[PDB]
Structure formats: C-alpha cells, structure tokens
Amino acid sequence: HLTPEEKSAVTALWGKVNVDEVGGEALGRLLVVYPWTQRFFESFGDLSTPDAVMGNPKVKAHGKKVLGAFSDGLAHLDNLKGTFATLSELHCDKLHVDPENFRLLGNVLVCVLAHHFGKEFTPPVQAAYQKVVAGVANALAHKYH
C-alpha cells in the first residue's frame, strides 16, 4: 500500500520515464546479471556478450512490452492482482518462471531508474518504487500461491 505522497512521487517520476529504452535496459541487465534467465529467451538470437544482449532488437521490444505491463500495473495500484491474472497464468502455468526472478527483475528496474534519474531518485522515491515492484511481483506470482 502506498501513501498519497508516495503515489504522487511515483507518478511524477514515471511521467518522465522514456518508455522506449527503460524496459529494454532492465531486461538486458536482468539477462546479463542473472544469466540463467537467458534460458527463457533462447529464441531472441545472440545473447553471448553483454553488448550483444543490450543491442538485441528482440530484447528491446520485449522490454518495451514489460515496461508497458509495469505502466498498466502502476495505473491500477489497488487491483494489481486482477491486473496481472493472465500474465500470472502465462508466466507460471506456461513458462514455468520461478517467482524469485520477478523480484530480481523488479530490483533491476529500480536500479535502472536510479541510474537514469540520479539525485532525483531520492530514498523516499526508491522506497515507494520498491513497494510498487514488490506488489507487481506478488501479483505476478499469484498462480504459485
């Protein structure tokens, strides 16, 4: 649950997020830092080096999709469980992704936001975004509960 101050700060920061590169950066960094996640993306082409990962158009497009899903969850902060029902079904009963990777990707996204915004990404803003990503990961891992 987020306080109105946290919601306002999160919305103000997300309004300045570049939706064409942030998701791709987060997905690429997830692949580089946790290379076992590359097992789920063997149809994306070359993932042998970090530069090849960050330069992959498939990774960029899929990161765009994931960032769109995150924006969808951010637009409905009180119905994350119903916002992510079909995505939870896809990720659990079809892709068999272990739910710890959801938390890993959320923390990678937090790191990417910190990298992009610098001093603007204050500790209170980070705490609000940690709440948001924890909620998103919990909603996505509902099918395992």
Binding site: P50, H115, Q126, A127
Partner: protein, 139 residues
C-alpha cells in the same frame, strides 16, 4: 568470481574514492526506508535523516568494503572478525545482506552513471554476494 569481475570491481570501487562514507550512509538510509524490518538490528541507533550515527556506520561499512576490494582473493581471511560479529553476536538474517547489497547498487547507480555499465553492475552484484556469504559463513 572471475578475473574480469575482480578487475571491474576494483576499477568501479576505485572510482568511488573519497565518497565511500557518504555512499555507505546513503545506502543505509535507503535500506532503512525501503525495508523497515532491517531497523530492528539498530535499536540503540538514531536512524533519522542526516544522523551522525548513520554517517559513522556508513563510513565503517564503506571502509570494510574497501578492505574487501583490496583483499578480493583473500576475503574470507580478511573479513574473519566481521563475519564473527555478524554471525555470532548479531545473528543477522542473510536476506538482509541481499537488501543492503541492492541498496548499495542503487546508490552506485544513482551516483556513478558512466561507471555503472551492465558488466560493472554484474561484477558488483557478484562481489557483494561474495562479501555477504563471507559475512554469513560462520552460521
């Protein structure tokens, strides 16, 4: 780790320089704000924003990390007293080390954009995990 990981970690932590104490204090502040359950390990601490106690503890943690970087191939021996502390006296849950490592990564990303490449990020993650598992080795 790897030789490449060690080189990346050494270069990145060298770029930290004299801001190590400030970065450690900011990482501690971020951990206390984002994960308030970590605050239970510091009941005798003044944990408000700008606290001198938090500043000193951040300096100590940063100095420990600098020593660990300087002794990356002999970390278990270099961190024996700290692991003794954290595992016997403190009994810290290991999950807390992951939380602090994440907050350190966030601070490094927010303060060193050019240095925080994906490869340097991976190397720093590996180094912080190694430090954490050394500090929880005694369990």
């Amino acid at each position: 780790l790897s030789p490449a990981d060690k080189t990346n970690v050494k270069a990145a932590w060298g770029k930290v320089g004299a801001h190590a104490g400030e970065y450690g204090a900011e990482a501690l502040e971020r951990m206390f704000l984002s994960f308030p359950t970590t605050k239970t390990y510091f009941p005798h601490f003044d944990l408000s924003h700008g606290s001198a106690q938090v500043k000193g503890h951040g300096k100590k943690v940063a100095d420990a990390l600098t020593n660990a970087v300087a002794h990356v191939d002999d970390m278990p021996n270099a961190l024996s007293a700290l692991s003794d502390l954290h595992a016997h006296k403190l009994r810290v849950d290991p999950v807390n080390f992951k939380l602090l490592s994440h907050c350190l990564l966030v601070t490094l990303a927010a303060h060193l954009p050019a240095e925080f490449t994906p490869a340097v990020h991976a190397s720093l993650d590996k180094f912080l995990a190694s430090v954490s598992t050394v500090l929880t080795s005694k369990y």
